[PDB]
Ligand binder design. Structure first.
Ligand SMILES: CN(C)C[C@H](O)Cn1c2ccc(Br)cc2c2cc(Br)ccc21
Length: 107
């Protein structure tokens, strides 16, 4: 499997998440799913989560959607769009520390 390269993307395999300049809309898109700077301030998770802003069609590409699916925040239904990002984090939540499993030291 794989994905098709895109020059119109904002994220790249280097920096990660630009919280300092994170789009307002996108900002709430995270706080709603249950994600903090801790998950965005990690080059390891920054990519693991990019599968969302990447698959969704695009961060700015989502703004045009958020405008249709809702209004200006508030507190009306947390699902829809955000409910998906919650499932993407579950994948990492299920993993405790199996990736780094293999003790060789004795004593
Ligand atoms: C349609 N796809 C292929 C294009 C990009 O994969 C979509 N995309 C963005 C577009 C604009 C900005 Br600004 C930020 C992002 C972004 C951030 C993360 Br993390 C993951 C995917 C992201």
């Amino acid at each position: 499997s794989g994905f098709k390269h895109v020059s119109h993307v904002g994220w790249d395999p280097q920096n990660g998440f630009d919280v300092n300049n994170l789009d307002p809309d996108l900002r709430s898109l995270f706080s709603r799913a249950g994600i903090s700077e801790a998950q965005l301030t990690d080059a390891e998770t920054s990519k693991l989560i990019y599968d969302f802003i990447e698959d969704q069609g695009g961060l700015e590409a989502v703004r045009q959607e958020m405008r249709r699916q809702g209004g200006s925040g508030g507190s009306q239904s947390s699902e829809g769009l955000v409910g998906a990002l919650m499932h993407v984090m579950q994948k990492r939540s299920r993993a405790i520390h199996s990736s780094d499993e293999g003790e060789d030291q004795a004593g």
